[PDB]
Amino acid sequence: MIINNLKLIREKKKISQSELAALLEVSRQTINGIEKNKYNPSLQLALKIAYYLNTPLEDIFQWQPE
């Protein structure tokens, strides 16, 4: 609803996991599977993807820890 998640930000810019997921330097499917109910990329990890994601780590690391 309110930012909440990487996907939630991501959908807004229409970028799919397949786009972003390669960059994190983790198995792409695994994050795709893991974002599928396990967890988001670690914030430092997210930064790597965030950099290419048109979305700063700060963009997802909003003062809304929810």
CATH at 22 = 1.10.260.40
Nearest to 65 by CA among 3, 21, 1: 3
Nearest to 24 by CA among 43, 5, 9: 43
* CB-CB neighbours of 1 under 10 Å: 6
Which letter does DSSP use for residue 42 in this model? P
**What distance separates the 2 farthest-apart alpha carbons in the chain?**
29
How far is residue 4's CA from residue 62's CA, in Å, rounded to a whole number? 9
- Domain count along the chain: 1
Q: Which ranges in 3-60 belong to alpha helices (H)?
A: 6-12, 17-21, 28-34, 43-52, 57-60
**36 is in which domain, residue-wise?**
1-66
Q: What is the CA radius of gyration of the chain?
A: 11
Q: Which residues have C-beta within 8 Å of that of residue 4, sequence separation ≥ 6?
A: 64, 66
